[model samples]
Target chain A: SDTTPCCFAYIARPLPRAHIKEYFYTSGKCSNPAVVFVTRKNRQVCANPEKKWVREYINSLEM
Target chain B: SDTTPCCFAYIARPLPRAHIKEYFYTSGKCSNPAVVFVTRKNRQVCANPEKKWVREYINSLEMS
Candidate 1:
Protein backbone atom coordinates (compact mmCIF):
# COMPACT_ATOMS: atom_id res chain seq x y z
CA SER A 1 0.00 0.00 0.00
CA ASP A 2 1.08 3.59 -0.48
CA THR A 3 -0.04 4.96 2.90
CA THR A 4 0.03 3.92 6.51
CA PRO A 5 -2.37 1.07 6.96
CA CYS A 6 -4.98 2.08 9.49
CA CYS A 7 -5.93 -0.77 11.80
CA PHE A 8 -9.41 -1.36 13.03
CA ALA A 9 -9.14 0.26 16.41
CA TYR A 10 -11.19 -1.34 19.15
CA ILE A 11 -13.59 1.55 19.05
CA ALA A 12 -17.36 1.38 19.05
CA ARG A 13 -19.57 4.00 17.56
CA PRO A 14 -21.97 5.67 19.96
CA LEU A 15 -25.51 4.48 19.53
CA PRO A 16 -28.34 6.95 19.90
CA ARG A 17 -29.54 7.65 23.47
CA ALA A 18 -26.65 9.23 25.28
CA HIS A 19 -24.47 6.57 26.74
CA ILE A 20 -22.64 9.40 28.38
CA LYS A 21 -19.69 7.37 29.52
CA GLU A 22 -19.23 5.77 26.13
CA TYR A 23 -19.57 9.08 24.34
CA PHE A 24 -17.00 10.82 26.49
CA TYR A 25 -14.56 7.93 26.47
CA THR A 26 -14.57 7.28 22.73
CA SER A 27 -14.26 11.00 22.07
CA GLY A 28 -11.03 11.12 24.01
CA LYS A 29 -9.45 8.36 21.94
CA CYS A 30 -10.05 9.80 18.49
CA SER A 31 -9.30 13.51 18.76
CA ASN A 32 -6.98 14.69 15.99
CA PRO A 33 -6.03 11.07 15.46
CA ALA A 34 -6.66 11.75 11.79
CA VAL A 35 -9.46 9.27 11.56
CA VAL A 36 -11.05 8.02 8.34
CA PHE A 37 -14.50 6.90 7.24
CA VAL A 38 -15.50 4.09 4.88
CA THR A 39 -18.85 3.47 3.31
CA ARG A 40 -20.71 0.91 1.15
CA LYS A 41 -23.67 0.82 -1.17
CA ASN A 42 -26.36 0.37 1.48
CA ARG A 43 -24.41 1.30 4.59
CA GLN A 44 -21.83 3.77 5.79
CA VAL A 45 -19.11 4.02 8.39
CA CYS A 46 -17.53 6.91 10.21
CA ALA A 47 -14.24 6.56 11.95
CA ASN A 48 -14.64 5.57 15.55
CA PRO A 49 -11.63 7.24 17.09
CA GLU A 50 -12.92 10.50 15.69
CA LYS A 51 -12.25 14.16 16.34
CA LYS A 52 -13.73 16.16 19.19
CA TRP A 53 -16.00 18.02 16.82
CA VAL A 54 -17.10 14.68 15.37
CA ARG A 55 -17.94 13.24 18.76
CA GLU A 56 -19.62 16.48 19.65
CA TYR A 57 -21.68 16.06 16.51
CA ILE A 58 -22.56 12.48 17.47
CA ASN A 59 -23.50 13.67 20.89
CA SER A 60 -26.02 15.84 19.12
CA LEU A 61 -27.43 12.65 17.59
CA GLU A 62 -28.24 11.38 21.06
CA MET A 63 -31.95 10.62 20.89
CA SER B 1 7.49 7.14 9.54
CA ASP B 2 3.97 5.78 9.62
CA THR B 3 2.10 8.05 7.21
CA THR B 4 2.19 8.73 3.52
CA PRO B 5 5.52 9.71 2.07
CA CYS B 6 4.39 13.13 0.94
CA CYS B 7 6.26 14.14 -2.14
CA PHE B 8 7.35 17.70 -2.44
CA ALA B 9 4.81 19.18 -4.76
CA TYR B 10 6.59 21.89 -6.70
CA ILE B 11 4.61 24.48 -4.77
CA ALA B 12 6.04 27.63 -3.29
CA ARG B 13 5.17 29.25 -0.01
CA PRO B 14 3.87 32.77 -0.30
CA LEU B 15 6.33 35.41 0.73
CA PRO B 16 4.91 37.56 3.51
CA ARG B 17 3.84 40.39 1.23
CA ALA B 18 0.60 40.84 -0.61
CA HIS B 19 1.03 39.13 -3.96
CA ILE B 20 -2.66 38.77 -4.71
CA LYS B 21 -2.55 36.37 -7.64
CA GLU B 22 -0.22 33.99 -5.87
CA TYR B 23 -2.40 33.83 -2.78
CA PHE B 24 -5.59 32.86 -4.60
CA TYR B 25 -3.97 30.26 -6.83
CA THR B 26 -2.08 28.50 -4.08
CA SER B 27 -5.18 28.39 -1.89
CA GLY B 28 -6.97 26.27 -4.45
CA LYS B 29 -4.25 23.63 -4.52
CA CYS B 30 -4.03 22.91 -0.79
CA SER B 31 -7.60 22.75 0.37
CA ASN B 32 -8.46 19.27 1.72
CA PRO B 33 -5.16 18.17 0.32
CA ALA B 34 -4.19 16.71 3.72
CA VAL B 35 -0.90 18.54 3.96
CA VAL B 36 1.90 18.03 6.43
CA PHE B 37 4.03 20.62 8.22
CA VAL B 38 7.56 19.78 9.23
CA THR B 39 9.55 21.88 11.69
CA ARG B 40 12.83 21.79 13.55
CA LYS B 41 14.64 23.23 16.56
CA ASN B 42 15.89 26.52 15.12
CA ARG B 43 13.40 26.96 12.29
CA GLN B 44 10.11 25.65 10.93
CA VAL B 45 8.64 24.55 7.65
CA CYS B 46 4.99 24.44 6.74
CA ALA B 47 3.61 22.12 4.09
CA ASN B 48 2.62 23.80 0.87
CA PRO B 49 -0.67 22.63 -0.57
CA GLU B 50 -1.90 23.39 2.94
CA LYS B 51 -5.53 23.62 3.89
CA LYS B 52 -7.73 26.61 3.08
CA TRP B 53 -7.71 28.00 6.60
CA VAL B 54 -3.93 27.67 6.65
CA ARG B 55 -3.55 29.65 3.43
CA GLU B 56 -6.14 32.10 4.66
CA TYR B 57 -4.01 32.52 7.76
CA ILE B 58 -0.98 32.98 5.55
CA ASN B 59 -2.94 35.45 3.49
CA SER B 60 -3.34 37.45 6.67
CA LEU B 61 0.44 37.69 6.83
CA GLU B 62 0.45 39.61 3.58
CA MET B 63 2.15 43.03 3.92
CA SER B 64 -0.15 44.80 1.52
Candidate 2:
Protein backbone atom coordinates (compact mmCIF):
# COMPACT_ATOMS: atom_id res chain seq x y z
CA SER A 1 0.00 0.00 0.00
CA ASP A 2 2.56 2.55 -1.09
CA THR A 3 -0.09 5.00 -2.18
CA THR A 4 -1.81 4.77 1.18
CA PRO A 5 -0.28 5.92 4.46
CA CYS A 6 -0.82 4.67 7.97
CA CYS A 7 -2.55 7.78 9.21
CA PHE A 8 -5.10 5.79 11.12
CA ALA A 9 -3.67 2.83 13.03
CA TYR A 10 -6.93 1.18 14.01
CA ILE A 11 -8.52 1.47 10.59
CA ALA A 12 -6.53 -1.11 8.58
CA ARG A 13 -7.83 0.37 5.34
CA PRO A 14 -4.86 2.44 4.30
CA LEU A 15 -5.87 5.99 3.51
CA PRO A 16 -4.01 7.44 0.58
CA ARG A 17 -0.89 9.28 1.57
CA ALA A 18 -1.84 12.83 0.77
CA HIS A 19 1.12 15.18 1.04
CA ILE A 20 -1.11 18.23 0.97
CA LYS A 21 -4.02 18.31 3.39
CA GLU A 22 -7.28 20.08 2.38
CA TYR A 23 -9.53 21.86 4.83
CA PHE A 24 -12.08 24.75 4.90
CA TYR A 25 -12.84 27.47 7.38
CA THR A 26 -13.69 31.14 7.67
CA SER A 27 -12.25 30.19 11.14
CA GLY A 28 -12.08 27.26 13.60
CA LYS A 29 -10.36 25.62 16.63
CA CYS A 30 -8.96 22.70 14.65
CA SER A 31 -8.54 22.22 10.92
CA ASN A 32 -11.12 19.56 10.19
CA PRO A 33 -9.36 16.88 8.15
CA ALA A 34 -10.99 16.92 4.73
CA VAL A 35 -11.96 13.58 3.22
CA VAL A 36 -12.18 15.34 -0.08
CA PHE A 37 -12.42 18.91 -1.17
CA VAL A 38 -15.69 19.36 -3.03
CA THR A 39 -14.23 22.04 -5.24
CA ARG A 40 -15.92 19.74 -7.66
CA LYS A 41 -17.69 16.40 -7.10
CA ASN A 42 -15.21 13.85 -5.68
CA ARG A 43 -14.80 10.89 -3.30
CA GLN A 44 -14.41 11.70 0.38
CA VAL A 45 -10.87 10.23 0.76
CA CYS A 46 -10.41 11.33 4.36
CA ALA A 47 -7.72 9.97 6.70
CA ASN A 48 -6.28 10.39 10.22
CA PRO A 49 -8.67 12.79 11.89
CA GLU A 50 -6.69 13.02 15.13
CA LYS A 51 -7.19 16.72 15.89
CA LYS A 52 -3.65 17.49 17.02
CA TRP A 53 -1.92 15.74 14.11
CA VAL A 54 -4.22 17.46 11.64
CA ARG A 55 -3.41 20.82 13.20
CA GLU A 56 0.30 20.06 13.10
CA TYR A 57 0.16 18.80 9.54
CA ILE A 58 -1.69 21.91 8.41
CA ASN A 59 0.88 24.02 10.19
CA SER A 60 3.72 22.07 8.63
CA LEU A 61 2.32 22.99 5.23
CA GLU A 62 2.27 26.63 6.29
CA MET A 63 5.79 26.56 7.71
CA SER B 1 -22.47 30.23 -13.27
CA ASP B 2 -19.68 32.38 -11.87
CA THR B 3 -18.66 29.73 -9.30
CA THR B 4 -21.57 28.83 -7.08
CA PRO B 5 -23.74 25.67 -7.20
CA CYS B 6 -27.48 25.07 -7.32
CA CYS B 7 -29.68 21.99 -6.71
CA PHE B 8 -30.24 19.42 -9.51
CA ALA B 9 -27.97 21.30 -11.85
CA TYR B 10 -26.20 19.36 -14.61
CA ILE B 11 -22.62 20.46 -14.23
CA ALA B 12 -20.36 20.05 -17.28
CA ARG B 13 -17.05 21.46 -16.15
CA PRO B 14 -14.32 20.94 -13.59
CA LEU B 15 -15.36 22.73 -10.40
CA PRO B 16 -12.32 21.82 -8.26
CA ARG B 17 -13.13 24.60 -5.83
CA ALA B 18 -16.08 23.58 -3.65
CA HIS B 19 -15.68 23.51 0.15
CA ILE B 20 -17.14 21.44 3.14
CA LYS B 21 -20.47 20.20 1.78
CA GLU B 22 -18.22 18.89 -1.01
CA TYR B 23 -20.29 18.87 -4.20
CA PHE B 24 -23.31 16.59 -4.30
CA TYR B 25 -22.60 13.04 -3.16
CA THR B 26 -22.52 10.55 -6.03
CA SER B 27 -25.77 8.63 -5.85
CA GLY B 28 -27.95 6.58 -8.19
CA LYS B 29 -30.43 9.33 -9.01
CA CYS B 30 -29.91 10.93 -12.40
CA SER B 31 -29.72 8.10 -14.92
CA ASN B 32 -29.66 10.24 -18.06
CA PRO B 33 -26.28 11.36 -16.80
CA ALA B 34 -24.42 9.06 -14.47
CA VAL B 35 -23.46 10.77 -11.26
CA VAL B 36 -19.70 11.35 -10.95
CA PHE B 37 -17.50 11.59 -7.88
CA VAL B 38 -14.22 13.52 -7.64
CA THR B 39 -10.54 12.80 -7.02
CA ARG B 40 -7.79 15.41 -7.12
CA LYS B 41 -4.00 15.47 -7.09
CA ASN B 42 -3.73 18.36 -4.67
CA ARG B 43 -6.83 20.40 -3.71
CA GLN B 44 -10.52 19.77 -3.04
CA VAL B 45 -13.60 21.53 -1.70
CA CYS B 46 -16.59 20.65 0.54
CA ALA B 47 -20.18 21.88 0.21
CA ASN B 48 -23.60 21.81 1.93
CA PRO B 49 -24.47 18.16 1.16
CA GLU B 50 -26.58 17.82 4.33
CA LYS B 51 -28.56 20.99 3.73
CA LYS B 52 -32.17 20.15 2.82
CA TRP B 53 -31.91 21.98 -0.49
CA VAL B 54 -28.95 19.85 -1.49
CA ARG B 55 -30.46 16.58 -0.26
CA GLU B 56 -33.84 17.21 -1.94
CA TYR B 57 -32.07 17.82 -5.21
CA ILE B 58 -30.26 14.50 -4.84
CA ASN B 59 -33.58 12.81 -4.07
CA SER B 60 -35.07 14.25 -7.24
CA LEU B 61 -32.14 12.81 -9.15
CA GLU B 62 -33.24 9.38 -7.98
CA MET B 63 -36.59 9.94 -9.71
CA SER B 64 -35.40 12.07 -12.62
Candidate 3:
Protein backbone atom coordinates (compact mmCIF):
# COMPACT_ATOMS: atom_id res chain seq x y z
CA SER A 1 0.00 0.00 0.00
CA ASP A 2 2.63 2.50 1.05
CA THR A 3 5.14 1.33 -1.52
CA THR A 4 3.13 1.99 -4.68
CA PRO A 5 4.76 4.41 -7.13
CA CYS A 6 2.77 7.42 -8.45
CA CYS A 7 3.59 9.76 -11.30
CA PHE A 8 3.95 13.49 -10.81
CA ALA A 9 4.30 14.43 -14.48
CA TYR A 10 3.61 12.79 -17.84
CA ILE A 11 5.57 12.58 -21.07
CA ALA A 12 4.39 14.68 -23.98
CA ARG A 13 4.50 11.77 -26.45
CA PRO A 14 4.00 8.05 -26.67
CA LEU A 15 6.88 5.62 -26.33
CA PRO A 16 8.02 3.47 -29.22
CA ARG A 17 5.79 0.41 -29.49
CA ALA A 18 8.68 -2.03 -29.36
CA HIS A 19 10.35 -0.57 -26.29
CA ILE A 20 7.44 -0.75 -23.89
CA LYS A 21 7.11 -3.84 -21.71
CA GLU A 22 4.03 -3.26 -19.58
CA TYR A 23 2.12 -0.61 -17.59
CA PHE A 24 0.51 -0.03 -14.23
CA TYR A 25 -1.97 2.60 -13.08
CA THR A 26 -1.01 5.02 -10.36
CA SER A 27 -2.74 4.90 -7.04
CA GLY A 28 -5.79 7.10 -6.45
CA LYS A 29 -3.84 8.88 -3.73
CA CYS A 30 -1.85 10.65 -6.41
CA SER A 31 -3.28 14.13 -7.03
CA ASN A 32 -2.10 13.95 -10.63
CA PRO A 33 -2.84 10.41 -11.69
CA ALA A 34 -0.94 8.76 -14.52
CA VAL A 35 -0.13 5.45 -16.18
CA VAL A 36 3.33 4.14 -15.41
CA PHE A 37 4.71 2.57 -18.56
CA VAL A 38 7.47 0.08 -17.91
CA THR A 39 10.08 -0.36 -20.61
CA ARG A 40 11.98 -3.36 -21.88
CA LYS A 41 15.10 -1.76 -20.49
CA ASN A 42 13.66 -1.63 -16.99
CA ARG A 43 12.47 1.93 -16.94
CA GLN A 44 9.15 3.52 -16.02
CA VAL A 45 7.59 6.43 -17.92
CA CYS A 46 4.61 8.40 -16.76
CA ALA A 47 1.86 9.24 -19.21
CA ASN A 48 -1.33 11.26 -18.89
CA PRO A 49 -4.29 8.94 -18.40
CA GLU A 50 -6.56 11.07 -20.59
CA LYS A 51 -4.37 10.88 -23.67
CA LYS A 52 -5.85 8.74 -26.41
CA TRP A 53 -2.34 7.63 -27.37
CA VAL A 54 -1.77 6.33 -23.90
CA ARG A 55 -5.01 4.42 -23.87
CA GLU A 56 -4.17 2.91 -27.24
CA TYR A 57 -0.80 1.74 -26.07
CA ILE A 58 -2.39 0.04 -23.10
CA ASN A 59 -4.92 -1.59 -25.34
CA SER A 60 -2.23 -2.79 -27.70
CA LEU A 61 -0.61 -4.60 -24.83
CA GLU A 62 -3.87 -6.31 -23.98
CA MET A 63 -4.38 -7.42 -27.54
CA SER B 1 14.15 6.78 -24.53
CA ASP B 2 10.75 8.03 -23.34
CA THR B 3 8.84 5.44 -21.38
CA THR B 4 10.62 5.46 -18.05
CA PRO B 5 8.49 6.23 -14.97
CA CYS B 6 9.58 8.59 -12.20
CA CYS B 7 8.17 9.26 -8.78
CA PHE B 8 6.27 12.41 -8.03
CA ALA B 9 6.23 11.72 -4.28
CA TYR B 10 7.53 9.20 -1.77
CA ILE B 11 6.08 7.36 1.17
CA ALA B 12 6.54 8.97 4.60
CA ARG B 13 7.90 5.70 5.99
CA PRO B 14 9.59 2.54 4.84
CA LEU B 15 7.47 -0.28 3.53
CA PRO B 16 6.84 -3.32 5.65
CA ARG B 17 10.10 -5.28 5.32
CA ALA B 18 8.28 -8.33 3.98
CA HIS B 19 6.14 -6.93 1.19
CA ILE B 20 8.85 -5.65 -1.11
CA LYS B 21 9.72 -7.96 -4.04
CA GLU B 22 12.42 -6.05 -5.93
CA TYR B 23 13.79 -2.55 -6.59
CA PHE B 24 14.98 -0.46 -9.51
CA TYR B 25 16.51 2.99 -9.83
CA THR B 26 14.66 5.76 -11.60
CA SER B 27 16.22 7.25 -14.70
CA GLY B 28 18.62 10.20 -14.37
CA LYS B 29 16.35 12.38 -16.51
CA CYS B 30 14.01 12.74 -13.56
CA SER B 31 14.57 15.87 -11.50
CA ASN B 32 13.77 13.86 -8.39
CA PRO B 33 15.62 10.58 -8.54
CA ALA B 34 14.12 7.69 -6.59
CA VAL B 35 14.07 3.96 -6.12
CA VAL B 36 11.03 2.08 -7.40
CA PHE B 37 10.22 -0.66 -4.97
CA VAL B 38 8.39 -3.52 -6.62
CA THR B 39 6.16 -5.62 -4.44
CA ARG B 40 5.22 -9.28 -4.63
CA LYS B 41 1.84 -8.13 -5.84
CA ASN B 42 3.48 -6.43 -8.86
CA ARG B 43 2.94 -2.86 -7.69
CA GLN B 44 5.78 -0.37 -7.83
CA VAL B 45 6.32 1.98 -4.88
CA CYS B 46 8.57 5.02 -5.17
CA ALA B 47 11.08 5.68 -2.44
CA ASN B 48 13.49 8.51 -1.66
CA PRO B 49 16.97 7.61 -2.85
CA GLU B 50 18.51 9.36 0.12
CA LYS B 51 16.81 7.28 2.75
CA LYS B 52 18.90 4.77 4.68
CA TRP B 53 15.96 2.43 4.69
CA VAL B 54 15.92 2.53 0.94
CA ARG B 55 19.60 1.69 0.68
CA GLU B 56 19.34 -1.06 3.25
CA TYR B 57 16.49 -2.70 1.45
CA ILE B 58 18.33 -2.52 -1.84
CA ASN B 59 21.43 -4.00 -0.23
CA SER B 60 19.37 -6.79 1.22
CA LEU B 61 18.22 -7.73 -2.24
CA GLU B 62 21.71 -7.65 -3.67
CA MET B 63 22.93 -10.06 -0.98
CA SER B 64 20.36 -12.60 -1.96
Lowest lDDT 10-residue stretch of candidate 3 chain A? A1-10
For B1-64, candidate 1 gives per-residue lDDT tens digits of: 3342333453365433322222212111222332333223222233444345544533343322
Ranking by TM-score: 3, 2, 1
Give per-residue CA lDDT, model 3, range B7-50, as digits (tens). 67888876898988888997665556778988889888888888
Top model by DockQ, which number? Answer: 3
Model 3: runs farther than 4 Å from truth?
A1-63
**Per lDDT, what order, best first?**
3, 1, 2
RMSD of each: 14.3, 13.6, 7.5
lDDT of 1 by residue, A1-63 (tens): 243333333224222222222222223343333333321111122344445655565555564
Q: Which stretches of candidate 1 lie over 4 Å from their true place?
A: A1-35, A38-51, A60-63, B1-4, B8-10, B13-64
Tens digits of per-residue lDDT, candidate 2, B1-64, equal 1112112333443343332122243322211222332335432222244444445444654564
- The model with the greater TM-score, 2 or 3, is 3
Recovered native contacts, candidate 2: 0.00
lDDT scores of the candidates, listed in order: 0.33, 0.33, 0.77
Decoy 2 TM-score against native: 0.24
Number of the top lDDT candidate: 3
